[PDB]
């Protein structure tokens, strides 16, 4: 706002919830303004690997900076995600081979890896009341909704008024004002190892009240990955559905996730957590086993609000749960344990494409979203050891 | 070492002005809060005012705008707080504390260090 | 403003046993709330900062909490050195407000 109000203050952790929200927005961002432009050895392999590359070298990458959050502090690896997602949108303005795309998504990949890991782990350890770090994790996960709500508008809007390179452009002076912001609150210049070593990281994947919750992320994030891109083939096969109800169909699915992850931030405590995800985790599955039941584009309206509100409940219910777990049972370090909730996340997003194409081509869609939807199923009842792990 | 000193009584007249001082040392001087504080005996504590040595850019309570004006000297590395019209009321000991960053960040967490304070009697 | 009540003004304990003060908040305060201990001759020092978070040095006997708008500030193993003043400040919202302190004293 007014330098008036910014020169006199006391920053205040919100600060940082702002800091890490807009990283996810743009990180979202980038990752949707892509998609529609991507077409432009075989062409197959040349598409999958190109889609798949950002999840897996995000994936890969995530637990080298958990543990290097531990050994040097959050704001560099903040800094660094930083610096490497501006690099990653300026190559993408600024290239037009394959070879190019693939090292850009790849940038992105590490960049992602960076912000999501440290700010998700720098939020856990400022903000230890359960109540209030759970709020302040479901305002930060909004963050992915806003941004895939807005990307494709403005990319669509910039592409053909300015110019193909003109939303690079602009997403990169965002991503410029972003990190004018970051500089004022991060001191990304000095070495703080924590006080405390964290417990390792193959005792945490030892836990059976962690795994639950992590299969809980994953199993919930992969219908919703396997059902983004296979949802409009099935629509132009069996509707015969317009170009742009294509893109108007998923839209409740982003709206419903973007209002349930604010509101069930501030419910899951109150509600139990282990009784939101149960939840959601029936909702996904009674949601998407109803989606193939749907003749019209009217029909797709009900089905993917759920989906998107379910989702959205089980993600605001599990996150801070991971926090709450690595304190009850083990050391008071939190940047290791996200990198296993962002390898739950990426998971789905690495082999969604591939594994949806292959099932719809060998059985159906209908038949791929009955599996989904068993599968979330019978998972939910697995939520309810989470009601109350023994402590140390 | 950090170090806040101030001067250990004052003595006024009634309806006169007074200029207390609280000098640094031991850390950069221009990179900190300073906080002025009120607390008068038998009574709670009183928040006066924020100032920041680099720009100098005030913080008051509205209680005391008209009472107190915040000042820095940063030459020698002193923060002066003026207090005028003084009557039998203002007969307090006045603190003068530091603002800490969390580390890493610019977050402001509690005031690590405090001066002694500085015994403040209206009397004729 | 929000005014900070703290209760009880002087506490009497005994070395050994365990104490606790309370600090109620008028506006909804969150964790934005310290607490400070004055000894009979020195200067204020932190205790615990965010509500929930104890300063470096402090020993393990003092532990923070807050449900709701009530701030508590525990010490489970009174000692010798204990007995001093201590008062609870919420920065959340300008001008900043403390709490009017509480004294520990021992029983006879």
């Known amino acids: 706002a007014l330098v008036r109000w910014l020169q006199e203050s006391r920053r205040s952790r919100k600060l940082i919830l702002f800091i890490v929200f807009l990283a996810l927005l743009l990180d979202n961002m980038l990752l949707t303004v892509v998609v529609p432009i991507i077409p432009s050895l075989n062409e197959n392999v040349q598409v999958g690997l190109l889609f798949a590359s950002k999840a897996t070298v995000q994936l890969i990458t995530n637990p080298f900076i958990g543990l290097l959050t531990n050994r040097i502090g959050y704001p560099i690896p903040i800094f660094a995600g930083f610096c490497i997602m501006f690099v990653s949108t300026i190559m993408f303005a600024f290239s037009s081979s394959y070879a190019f795309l693939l090292i850009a998504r790849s940038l992105q990949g590490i960049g992602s890896s960076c912000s999501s890991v440290a700010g998700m782990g720098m939020l856990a350890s400022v903000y230890t009341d359960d109540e209030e770090r759970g709020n302040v994790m479901g305002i930060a996960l909004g963050g992915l909704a806003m941004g895939v709500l807005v990307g494709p508008p403005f990319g669509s809007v910039l592409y053909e008024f300015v110019g193909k390179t003109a939303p690079f452009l602009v997403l990169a002076a965002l991503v410029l004002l972003d990190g004018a912001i970051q500089l004022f609150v991060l001191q990304p210049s000095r070495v703080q190892p924590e006080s405390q070593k964290g417990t390792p990281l193959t005792t945490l994947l030892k836990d059976p009240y962690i795994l639950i919750a992590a299969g809980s992320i994953c199993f919930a994030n992969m219908g919703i990955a396997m059902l983004e891109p296979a949802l409009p083939i099935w629509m132009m096969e069996t509707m015969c559905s317009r170009k742009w109800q294509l893109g108007v169909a998923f839209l409740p699915a982003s709206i419903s996730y973007l209002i349930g992850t604010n509101i069930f931030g501030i419910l899951a405590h109150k509600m139990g957590r282990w009784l939101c995800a149960l939840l959601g985790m029936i909702i996904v599955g009674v949601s998407i086993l109803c989606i193939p039941f749907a003749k019209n584009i009217y029909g797709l309206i009900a089905p993917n609000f759920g989906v998107g509100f379910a989702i959205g409940m089980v993600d605001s219910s599990m996150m801070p749960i991971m926090g709450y777990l690595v304190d009850l049972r083990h050391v008071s370090v939190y940047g290791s344990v996200y990198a296993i909730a962002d390898v739950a996340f990426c998971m789905g997003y690495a082999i969604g494409p591939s594994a949806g194409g292959a099932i719809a081509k060998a059985i159906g869609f209908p038949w791929l979203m009955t599996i989904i939807g068993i599968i979330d199923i019978l998972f939910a009842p697995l939520c309810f050891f989470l009601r109350s792990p023994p402590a140390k | 070492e950090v170090k806040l000193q101030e001067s250990g009584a004052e003595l006024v007249k009634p309806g006169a002005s007074v200029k207390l001082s609280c000098k640094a040392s031991?850390?950069?001087?221009?990179?900190?809060?300073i906080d002025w504080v009120k607390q008068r005996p038998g009574q709670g504590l009183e928040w006066i005012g924020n100032?920041?040595?680099?720009?100098?850019?005030?913080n008051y309570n509205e209680k005391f705008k008209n009472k107190a004006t915040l000042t820095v000297d940063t030459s020698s590395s002193t923060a002066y707080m003026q207090l005028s019209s003084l009557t039998s009321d203002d007969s307090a000991v006045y603190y003068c504390?530091?603002?800490?960053?969390?580390?890493?960040?610019?977050?402001?967490?509690?005031?690590?260090?405090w001066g002694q304070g500085t015994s403040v009697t209206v009397s004729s | 403003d929000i005014v900070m009540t703290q209760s009880q003004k002087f506490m009497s304990t005994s070395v050994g046993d365990r104490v606790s003060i309370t600090c109620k908040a008028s506006?909804?305060?969150?964790?934005?709330v310290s607490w400070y201990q004055q000894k009979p001759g020195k200067s204020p020092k932190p205790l615990i900062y965010?509500?929930?978070n104890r300063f470096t040095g402090v020993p393990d006997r003092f532990t923070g909490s807050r449900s709701g708008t009530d701030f508590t500030l525990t010490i489970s193993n009174v000692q010798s050195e204990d007995l001093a003043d201590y008062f609870c400040?919420?920065?959340?919202?300008?001008?900043?407000?403390f709490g009017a302190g509480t004294k520990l004293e021992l029983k006879r």
């Open positions: 504390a530091r603002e800490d960053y969390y580390d890493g960040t610019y977050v402001y967490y509690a005031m690590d260090f």
């Open positions: 506006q909804n305060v969150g964790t934005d």
């Open positions: 031991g850390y950069t001087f221009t990179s900190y809060w």
């Open positions: 100032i920041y040595p680099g720009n100098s850019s005030t």
């Open positions: 965010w509500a929930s």
């Open positions: 400040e919420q920065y959340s919202s300008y001008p900043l407000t």
